[PDB]
């Protein structure tokens, strides 16, 4: 009862979230700075860290 | 100063250039001249585009 497993979706979720944050840094940086009307959402994205 | 602008902008240009080239000069085992570098950055951007 002190002891818990870890299957995959747990760990997948972990690293995925990390990639989301790797992007999120740039997200904040490019949110506050860039133009607002015209900056597409995928004009911000780089899925490579993910 | 007689240009009357914020000095931030001036030194931003200057130091941007300095760093932008110093990373390119250094930062590898092999030196890679800059024509490669600019071509490579074009690639990195339009890849994603």
DSSP string covering B3-17: T-S-HHHHHHHHHHH
Tokens 């990390």 -> residue: A18
Method by which this entry was solved: cryo-EM
Decide: A42 and A16 in contact? Cβ < 8 Å: no
Q: Using CA atoms, how far apart are residues B32 and B29, in angstroms rounded to an integer? A: 9
Q: Under a CB-based contact definition with an 8 Å cutoff, are residues A50 and A22 in contact?
A: yes
Evaluated on CA atoms B31, B35, B36, B41, the torsion sign reads positive
- Answer left, alpha or beta for residue B34, where phi above 0 means left and psi between -120 and 50 means alpha: alpha
Rounded-to-integer distance, Cα A13 and Cα A7, Å: 11
Q: Tokens in use for A35? A: 């133009």
């Amino acid at each position: 009862g002190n002891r818990r497993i870890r299957s995959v979706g747990e760990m997948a979720e972990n690293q995925f979230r990390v990639g989301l944050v790797r992007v999120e840094r740039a997200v904040k940086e490019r949110l506050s700075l860039g133009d607002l009307d015209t900056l597409m959402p995928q004009d911000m994205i780089n899925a490579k860290p993910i | 100063y007689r240009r009357g602008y914020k000095f931030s902008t001036y030194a931003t240009w200057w130091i941007r250039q300095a760093i932008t080239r110093s990373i390119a000069d250094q930062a590898r085992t092999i030196r890679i001249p800059v024509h490669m570098i600019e071509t490579i950055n074009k690639l990195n951007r339009i890849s994603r585009q």
